[PDB]
Amino acid sequence: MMSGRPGRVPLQFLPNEARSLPPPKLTDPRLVYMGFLGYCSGLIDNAIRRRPVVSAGLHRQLLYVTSFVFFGYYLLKRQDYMYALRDHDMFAYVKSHPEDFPEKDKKTYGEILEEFHPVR
Amino acid sequence: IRLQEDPDPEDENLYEKNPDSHGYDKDPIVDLWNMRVVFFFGFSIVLVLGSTFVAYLPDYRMQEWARREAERLVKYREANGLPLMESNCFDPNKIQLPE
Amino acid sequence: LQYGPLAFVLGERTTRKLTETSKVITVDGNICSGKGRLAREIAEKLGLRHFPEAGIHYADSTTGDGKPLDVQLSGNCSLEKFYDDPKSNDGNSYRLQSWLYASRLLQYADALEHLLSTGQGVVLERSIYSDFVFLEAMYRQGFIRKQCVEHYNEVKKVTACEYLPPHVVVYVDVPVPEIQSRIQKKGNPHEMKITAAYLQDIENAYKKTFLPEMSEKCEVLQYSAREAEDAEKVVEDIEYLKCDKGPWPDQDDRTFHRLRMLVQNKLEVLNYTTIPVYLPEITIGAHQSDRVFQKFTELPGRKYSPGYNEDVGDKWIWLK
Amino acid sequence: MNPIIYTTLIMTVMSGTMLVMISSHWLLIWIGFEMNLLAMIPVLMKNFNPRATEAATKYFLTQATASMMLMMAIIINLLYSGQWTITKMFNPVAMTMMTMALAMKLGLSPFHFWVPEVTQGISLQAGLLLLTWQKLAPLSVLCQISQSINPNLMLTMAMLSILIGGWGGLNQTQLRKIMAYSSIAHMGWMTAVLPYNTTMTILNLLIYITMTLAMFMLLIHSSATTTLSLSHTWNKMPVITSLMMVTLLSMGGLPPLSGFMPKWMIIQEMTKNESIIMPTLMAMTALLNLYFYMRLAYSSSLTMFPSTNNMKMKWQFEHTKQMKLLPTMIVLSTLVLPMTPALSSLN
Amino acid sequence: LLDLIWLETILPKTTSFIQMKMSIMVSNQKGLIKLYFLSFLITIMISMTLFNYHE
Amino acid sequence: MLKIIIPTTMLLPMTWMSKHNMIWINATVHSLLISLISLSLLNQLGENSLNFSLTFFSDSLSAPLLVLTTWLLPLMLMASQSHLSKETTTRKKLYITMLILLQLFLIMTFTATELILFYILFEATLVPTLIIITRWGNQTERLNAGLYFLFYTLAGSLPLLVALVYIQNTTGSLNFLIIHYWSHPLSNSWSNIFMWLACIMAFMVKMPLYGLHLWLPKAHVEAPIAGSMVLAAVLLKLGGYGMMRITTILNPLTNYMAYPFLMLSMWGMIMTSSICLRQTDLKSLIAYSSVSHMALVIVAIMIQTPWSFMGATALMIAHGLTSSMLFCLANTNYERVHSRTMILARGLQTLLPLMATWWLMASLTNLALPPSINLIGELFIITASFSWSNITIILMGMNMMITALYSLYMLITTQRGKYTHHINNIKASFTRENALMALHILPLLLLTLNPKMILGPLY
Amino acid sequence: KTLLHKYSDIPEGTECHRKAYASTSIGGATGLIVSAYSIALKPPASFLEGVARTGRYTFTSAAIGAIFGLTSCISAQVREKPDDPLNYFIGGCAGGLTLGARTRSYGIGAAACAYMGLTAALVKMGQLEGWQVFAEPKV
Amino acid sequence: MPLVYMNIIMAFAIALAGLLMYRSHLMSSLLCLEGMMLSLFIMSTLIILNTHFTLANMMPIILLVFAACEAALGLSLLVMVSNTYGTDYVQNLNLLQC
Amino acid sequence: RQWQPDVEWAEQFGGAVMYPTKETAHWKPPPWNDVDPPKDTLVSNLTLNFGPQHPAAHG
Numbered sequence A: 001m002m003s004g005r006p007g008r009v010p011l012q013f014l015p016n017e018a019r020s021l022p023p024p025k026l027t028d029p030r031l032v033y034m035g036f037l038g039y040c041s042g043l044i045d046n047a048i049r050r051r052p053v054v055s056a057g058l059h060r061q062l063l064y065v066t067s068f069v070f071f072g073y074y075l076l077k078r079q080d081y082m083y084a085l086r087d088h089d090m091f092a093y094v095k096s097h098p099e100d101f102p103e104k105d106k107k108t109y110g111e112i113l114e115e116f117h118p119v120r
Numbered sequence B: 001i002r003l004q005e006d007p008d009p010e011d012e013n014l015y016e017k018n019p020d021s022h023g024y025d026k027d028p029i030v031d032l033w034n035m036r037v038v039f040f041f042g043f044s045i046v047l048v049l050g051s052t053f054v055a056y057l058p059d060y061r062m063q064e065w066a067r068r069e070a071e072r073l074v075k076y077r078e079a080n081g082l083p084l085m086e087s088n089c090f091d092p093n094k095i096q097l098p099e
Numbered sequence C: 001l002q003y004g005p006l007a008f009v010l011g012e013r014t015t016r017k018l019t020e021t022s023k024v025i026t027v028d029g030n031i032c033s034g035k036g037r038l039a040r041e042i043a044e045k046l047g048l049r050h051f052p053e054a055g056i057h058y059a060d061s062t063t064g065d066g067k068p069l070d071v072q073l074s075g076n077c078s079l080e081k082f083y084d085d086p087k088s089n090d091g092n093s094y095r096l097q098s099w100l101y102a103s104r105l106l107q108y109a110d111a112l113e114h115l116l117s118t119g120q121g122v123v124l125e126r127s128i129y130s131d132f133v134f135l136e137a138m139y140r141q142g143f144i145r146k147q148c149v150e151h152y153n154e155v156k157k158v159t160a161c162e163y164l165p166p167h168v169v170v171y172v173d174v175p176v177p178e179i180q181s182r183i184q185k186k187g188n189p190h191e192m193k194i195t196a197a198y199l200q201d202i203e204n205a206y207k208k209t210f211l212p213e214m215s216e217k218c219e220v221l222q223y224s225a226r227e228a229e230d231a232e233k234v235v236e237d238i239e240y241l242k243c244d245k246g247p248w249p250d251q252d253d254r255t256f257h258r259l260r261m262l263v264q265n266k267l268e269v270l271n272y273t274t275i276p277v278y279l280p281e282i283t284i285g286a287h288q289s290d291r292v293f294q295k296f297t298e299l300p301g302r303k304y305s306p307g308y309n310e311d312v313g314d315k316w317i318w319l320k
Numbered sequence D: 001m002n003p004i005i006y007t008t009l010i011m012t013v014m015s016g017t018m019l020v021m022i023s024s025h026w027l028l029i030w031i032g033f034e035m036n037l038l039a040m041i042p043v044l045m046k047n048f049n050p051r052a053t054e055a056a057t058k059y060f061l062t063q064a065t066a067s068m069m070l071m072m073a074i075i076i077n078l079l080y081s082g083q084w085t086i087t088k089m090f091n092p093v094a095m096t097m098m099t100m101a102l103a104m105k106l107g108l109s110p111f112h113f114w115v116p117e118v119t120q121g122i123s124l125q126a127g128l129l130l131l132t133w134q135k136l137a138p139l140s141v142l143c144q145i146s147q148s149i150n151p152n153l154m155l156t157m158a159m160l161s162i163l164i165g166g167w168g169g170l171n172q173t174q175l176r177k178i179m180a181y182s183s184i185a186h187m188g189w190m191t192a193v194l195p196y197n198t199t200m201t202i203l204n205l206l207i208y209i210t211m212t213l214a215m216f217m218l219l220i221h222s223s224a225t226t227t228l229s230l231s232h233t234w235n236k237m238p239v240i241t242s243l244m245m246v247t248l249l250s251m252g253g254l255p256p257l258s259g260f261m262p263k264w265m266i267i268q269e270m271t272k273n274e275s276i277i278m279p280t281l282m283a284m285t286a287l288l289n290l291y292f293y294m295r296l297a298y299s300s301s302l303t304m305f306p307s308t309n310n311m312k313m314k315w316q317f318e319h320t321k322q323m324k325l326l327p328t329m330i331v332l333s334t335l336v337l338p339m340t341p342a343l344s345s346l347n
Numbered sequence E: 001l002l003d004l005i006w007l008e009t010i011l012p013k014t015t016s017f018i019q020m021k022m023s024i025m026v027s028n029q030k031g032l033i034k035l036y037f038l039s040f041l042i043t044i045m046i047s048m049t050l051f052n053y054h055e
Numbered sequence F: 001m002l003k004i005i006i007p008t009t010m011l012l013p014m015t016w017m018s019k020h021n022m023i024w025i026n027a028t029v030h031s032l033l034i035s036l037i038s039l040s041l042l043n044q045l046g047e048n049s050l051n052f053s054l055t056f057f058s059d060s061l062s063a064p065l066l067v068l069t070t071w072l073l074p075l076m077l078m079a080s081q082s083h084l085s086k087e088t089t090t091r092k093k094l095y096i097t098m099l100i101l102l103q104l105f106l107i108m109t110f111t112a113t114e115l116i117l118f119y120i121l122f123e124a125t126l127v128p129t130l131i132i133i134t135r136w137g138n139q140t141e142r143l144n145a146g147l148y149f150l151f152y153t154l155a156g157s158l159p160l161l162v163a164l165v166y167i168q169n170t171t172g173s174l175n176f177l178i179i180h181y182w183s184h185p186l187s188n189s190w191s192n193i194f195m196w197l198a199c200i201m202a203f204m205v206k207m208p209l210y211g212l213h214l215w216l217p218k219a220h221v222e223a224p225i226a227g228s229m230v231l232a233a234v235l236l237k238l239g240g241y242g243m244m245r246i247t248t249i250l251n252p253l254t255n256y257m258a259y260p261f262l263m264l265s266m267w268g269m270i271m272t273s274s275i276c277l278r279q280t281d282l283k284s285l286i287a288y289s290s291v292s293h294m295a296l297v298i299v300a301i302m303i304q305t306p307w308s309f310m311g312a313t314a315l316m317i318a319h320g321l322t323s324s325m326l327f328c329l330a331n332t333n334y335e336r337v338h339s340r341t342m343i344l345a346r347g348l349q350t351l352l353p354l355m356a357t358w359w360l361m362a363s364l365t366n367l368a369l370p371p372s373i374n375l376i377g378e379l380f381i382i383t384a385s386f387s388w389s390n391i392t393i394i395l396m397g398m399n400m401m402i403t404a405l406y407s408l409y410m411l412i413t414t415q416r417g418k419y420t421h422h423i424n425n426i427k428a429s430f431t432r433e434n435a436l437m438a439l440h441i442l443p444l445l446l447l448t449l450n451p452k453m454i455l456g457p458l459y
Numbered sequence G: 001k002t003l004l005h006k007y008s009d010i011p012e013g014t015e016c017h018r019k020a021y022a023s024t025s026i027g028g029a030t031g032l033i034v035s036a037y038s039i040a041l042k043p044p045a046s047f048l049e050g051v052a053r054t055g056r057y058t059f060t061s062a063a064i065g066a067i068f069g070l071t072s073c074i075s076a077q078v079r080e081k082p083d084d085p086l087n088y089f090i091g092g093c094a095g096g097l098t099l100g101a102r103t104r105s106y107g108i109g110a111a112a113c114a115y116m117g118l119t120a121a122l123v124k125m126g127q128l129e130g131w132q133v134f135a136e137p138k139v
Numbered sequence H: 001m002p003l004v005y006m007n008i009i010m011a012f013a014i015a016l017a018g019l020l021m022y023r024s025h026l027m028s029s030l031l032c033l034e035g036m037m038l039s040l041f042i043m044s045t046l047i048i049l050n051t052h053f054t055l056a057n058m059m060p061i062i063l064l065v066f067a068a069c070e071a072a073l074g075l076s077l078l079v080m081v082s083n084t085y086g087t088d089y090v091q092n093l094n095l096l097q098c
Numbered sequence I: 001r002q003w004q005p006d007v008e009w010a011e012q013f014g015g016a017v018m019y020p021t022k023e024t025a026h027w028k029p030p031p032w033n034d035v036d037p038p039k040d041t042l043v044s045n046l047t048l049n050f051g052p053q054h055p056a057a058h059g
């Protein structure tokens, strides 16, 4: 699309302006889903290595969950950052082009004339 | 020999070992317990109890409620000599007819 | 530490470990010729590690506690049947050679792995390159079909090609009349049930075929029955011959790293022992394979990966 | 190959790809491509079989030719604009020549001929590298010149790619050939959305790349190259074929598996661009990929196949290689659809 | 005649046969690099030409 | 919902982490408990659809279907724990995983608030079903059946995806609420016709109209009993739910474009019901019977009449219980005889007298006798369609006559008549088989007292 | 696309001869491309078979375009309803019939009749309302 | 745009066709490769010297030092192909048919 | 029991080409180890005559 927006410093995962947004809440439904992946990401690890799937190396499953929820958290913060930034210049652009977004006058359904299609 | 495969297994009869089998599993004690749970939670809790539940929901679609307003609406309209149910639901005074 | 790629990087070579007595001197001979004894005699004299001749349950010995398990669970073949009635239609005749050759292949691999991990050579009875003589012997006597010949040769080609031919081969020569003398003295009723044509077919292929085509890439030791008692003689005979033949006096450390990498992966070494060639004698159907695999799975020790089976007592499985 | 020599050889191959993605001078891009070509032929040459010499040869002649034609797309653009930066290209035929050349590096139009053949001769692990790591650098240039690309050119190229990739996959029995044929098919999805917003291309790239590491690495652990060889794996490794089958539907792209992640957004995007016949053909012919996918699924885990007696030997021993990073590749390949809005981070 | 002589022939088998016939034609290359690169010459010649991709 | 969904998915670890032989016991007990919770959701406010959250909402059409799926879930476990008793625990547990994973998808499909969300799980039911047919199916053609079943609905569903995203680019959001409140006259133009074709053909493959029905005799026959029920009791109605919902932005165009499929369906029911009279396999008989009754529902929607939808929902759910029950009927004798040919197992009333009864109301319900919901469904559509055109009764009326002929034919040929002599491996019916059928027949008669819960949202 | 401009410039149902000539030229051009590809990936024994094969392929393609163009304009001419998509349908199916004649297989031509006739209405469908296959990037 | 640019442009074009028209010899085709990049070399020099792009004078040299460098591989794959088969013929370059 | 495919089903997927035709009626499946059969003797042991005209041959 942002690509080369006027100010995007390259290779900046979380630009300093992203902190002005509400950070993701610690028990975020999307974030805990990333935690779900971490549990799964260790679940096969016992499976493909031929180990007791439910209980074999709880540390590996613990590490898998812990890593995912962090990288998910930083991904989530940027995700909200871009979407807010996507909408931001969108909100400013329409006022930058007032004549080009002329919100129409509202005529109630009393005067609107739309034909009707009987069923038979 | 083509290959080494076991022939067609004999279709076991659950009654052959325990005639009191309920056709739910091999082990006699779980068969009785399987029979208990399938029935108990099949008819009493869901079929029987649920039927009384579903039979006794509150007013569905405000059905009797819809009837109730008709009576006063019926008594209102004919007493003062106005047609008991107007032809156009949306009052033509509100709308505008173009051209 | 394993030869995992880091091993070759930080300094673990193989040429340092190999020394003067770092050669695979296979020992062979006619049937019932005492080659197993003679192979053992060369073993303690030089200091060569001995590998007992692989049978049906050699792979059993490598895994778990050895404990040779059910034949139907650990090979689905019995050589005693081949002794009694070698024309059985169930295919147990060919199932010997296929499973035996795979057993020989595992023994050959573990021979090189020990050699490349300690430097001590290996004396092996009936190396993988001496398995084919039995097969055509079962082919010449009609015990197996010509398609059984093609599949085994194809397996031999796609497996033994990446397996270098041993330095020195040893054969104690015993003609058919002497073979008959030893077998009747043995006693085990199954091995009496042999045909002299089979014993004759063992020897000539071992002589007209085995010795020539391997002498090009090895130092052949054609030996009579007298030297079997004189096990001392072979000691200085192998020490005298320079062993300047075959691929061995040509490779470097990098090849030996490649060799140890493949042998360390035990599944790889025999990954081509089960080529999808649907031969009626060797193929096993879906239902039998599933149930037998189920029986194998519940066998103690093999339920999970080794060191992860709580049934044996592998404590800390929650943290291992 | 000496492992240290192999290690640095991959190091340059990534470096050449890295040079492409981190430079603006056209000439530096050609170096990144040539250096990558310079040190991947030996990777194919690791085993040194005459089949490998066959495939390693075929790759070089196509890839060397593509670099040369790409190189005139540099000089002609220089000849008609006096510029060296990667920007909106300033000459029509120069852009046509580069697109015609960059596509050959990937293979969408009959340029796709080398992709299956090259994959067959070379080893499985070297195949993995070819189908997943190289295919970043040519796409890296395209994402930067997409603004100047003739829209009515790759769309035919992408349509041809997805059509031929799916079409031939039905008749292939060698798992390497199926994998390469599917890559050609998915690469059609890559280029189809390219003239439009390229963020969806990156999402397709990332999703597909992680999706084929799982496919390949399970195949490596199976040590199988033919469908029958993969069929036998149910006996020794019944679960591995099961994860193979899970990848297969994500390979195909049926929701809720995240293999449908790329296709969905491609249709959504390309529908916003008043293009509705174009998505319909892609979704239609994408089913052709699913056909041989099911066939391989049917042989692998959905049914059972006659094993061999010697397979009982493999039961006793355990695999040695530690299938590095694989356990999360499968997870990040199937159940990722619910976390869809992450594509905003990609742009 | 209607259920599984024609209806299975109209949509299913015709589509299967169409995919059948052409998958033979798009998967029977002879492996000749000479033929491959000649096809490359055709595509590079045709693309820069009559389909007006040049402008 | 975030109320029934979690207990359903939390049931997934419950099957996985449970005792060896107790898997069936635990799964059956709590699956019935899930249904009991679903019984509550049946009540609906008069006009506004019951809304739970932004993602999920249930109207008076989803709720009658939603309870059926939850109530169905115990039945497959009951109906399938017989032939799979000789299987390993891991595969046994995996089978329970597949079924409840399927039932989870329907639960979130019928209650989806967004059409795109509706589509995602509408197709997602394909994966667990394909596993069920191919893996545990007991036949050779099941492989061909899986390909036929998968590709038929997927090839139809892809235009829906392209169609749905196009609506997104045109009319903003796509949830089932604002679509009905912001409806616009679909202008009659060639593009809109193809839009109409895309928005409809996907669902019409699911409830197979004549022609696009060749996957029913393949999928249903070769599938296992547990799979056989769902492919005929919920997923056929899955097209129905989409058809009711999506027919909100296609109604200046439905009237003109109804004709091609209407004649195909109306002739199809006479065609399909005729196929039954000369069938050979009992399972195919029931499967082909499903085509005819469902083809009636095709007509039911496309007339787009308050009565037409009213009998549509009643027919579909009454169809689901009946055809699933008959599929259990086919399974019971099939396990005991090990063949699906009808004439092989003649004269079974004399041997099994209760199975004679359970088959009697099974065929009687398929007869659509009054007041059984099958009648109150078919009869409702007859009246609405007759008002649409008078000649409809000539076709559909004759269908009822043809429906009777084969429906008693299966009862008479198998149960009635002289028993077959050489068969001697017939045992007394297990209390499981009899109890399974009771939980199919009593609910059907229980709803007969109150059709208000079965008449759908237009009520 | 000057060659395709010829077909578009000629109003359908009018100037049947020129529309027919444009149609067969489109078919001949496509016949050239496929034959050139065919001779490359499937080389013949010699040039005698080489010219024979490209002759067959071009003749079929040129013929199919010839009849379809002729039928399309003549049908719209006789019926005086050029905008009707059927005016391409009877041409597309007829073109499929000619394909069967060249292959001498009634089944192949009938299959070509159903498919080509449907697409012929569809391409007329696209030029009619607004449809674009390769749409310019707008968003 | 003068003829000196054009004449060598079709010099590449006939070279591009030459490499794409394998007769029997990959050695002959290989020899067509470096001639083809020589056309690139001369065009690079002609434009750069004409426009006095001072810093860009390095580029034509480094164009040689990679095209010639990869030409080592072009022989190296060839020098190995000619061993197993016995010739450089591309007719035998079809062992990988499947 | 549940039907399980035998080798007759396996041979359908066992060919080098999934859909055999007259053109592919002879395409042999690839070698299982991917090592194609090594070419026959291609040695170039040249024979040289170092004399008797050669001055080093000593006449």
Ligand SMILES: CCCCCCCCCCCCCCCCCC(=O)OC[C@H](COP(=O)(O)OCCN)OC(=O)CCCCCCCCCCCCCCCCC
Residues within 6 Å of the ligand: A051, A052, A053, A054, D237, D238, D239, D240, D242, D245, D246, D301, D302, F013, F016, F017, F090, F091, F094, F101, F127, F128, F131, F135
């Ligand atoms: C999206 C739709 C679905 C898509 C995926 C569908 C996948 C299956 C589809 C069919 C696949 C083909 C047919 C079946 C193939 C079976 C493959 C296989 O290997 O089966 C046999 C195998 C034997 O089991 P084994 O490996 O010994 O492991 C047993 C468990 N230790 O079996 C196994 O290995 C089974 C392993 C089971 C592991 C179970 C782990 C349970 C974990 C539960 C965690 C609960 C946490 C609860 C927390 C509560 C509080 C929050």
Ligand SMILES: CCCCCCCCCCCCCCCCCC(=O)OC[C@H](COP(=O)(O)OCCN)OC(=O)CCCCCCCCCCCCCCCCC
Residues within 6 Å of the ligand: G004, G007, G022, G023, G024, G026, G027, G030, G031, G034, G035, G056, G057, G058, G060, G061, G064, G065, G068, G069
């Ligand atoms: C409105 C404007 C246009 C008006 C005129 C109508 C359109 C142009 C004329 C019709 C074009 C489409 C019909 C097919 C033309 C090519 C026919 C052809 O090549 O026939 C030979 C051959 C088929 O026979 P074969 O399978 O080889 O069997 C015999 C083997 N000994 O061929 C083959 O084997 C090749 C593979 C099958 C054909 C592939 C598709 C070729 C055509 C692509 C679409 C062309 C569309 C042209 C018009 C739009 C674009 C300008």
Ligand SMILES: CCCCCCCCCCCCCCCCCC(=O)O[C@@H](COC(=O)CCCCCCCCCCCCCCC)COP(=O)(O)OC[C@H](O)CO
Residues within 6 Å of the ligand: D274, D276, D277, D280, D281, D284, D285, F155, F156, F159, F162, F163, F164, F166, F167, F190, F191, F192, F194, F195, F197, F198, F201, F202, G122, G129, G130, G131, G132
């Ligand atoms: C297996 C075959 C298919 C099975 C049956 C499926 C149903 C048949 C119809 C399939 C239609 C697929 C595409 C529909 C997507 C939504 C289209 C829509 O909403 O309507 C558009 C209808 O527009 C179309 O052109 C839609 C596609 C029409 C048909 C052409 C392609 C479909 C047919 C061939 C592909 C599918 C067949 C399989 C091929 C292997 C409106 O856009 P517009 O054209 O008005 O755009 C604005 C402006 O006018 C500029 O365009």
Ligand SMILES: Nc1nc2c(ncn2[C@@H]2O[C@H](COP(=O)(O)OP(=O)(O)OP(=O)(O)O)[C@@H](O)[C@H]2O)c(=O)[nH]1
Residues within 6 Å of the ligand: C029, C030, C031, C032, C033, C034, C035, C036, C037, C079, C096, C097, C100, C101, C104, C126, C130, C131, C134, C135
């Ligand atoms: N098929 C097959 N049979 C083998 C193989 N190795 C050994 N045998 C069988 O092993 C059996 C015993 O061999 P003998 O040589 O008689 O054994 P022995 O009596 O201990 O005598 P020595 O081997 O000389 O020690 C014979 O039936 C052989 O055919 C092999 O690789 N393949």
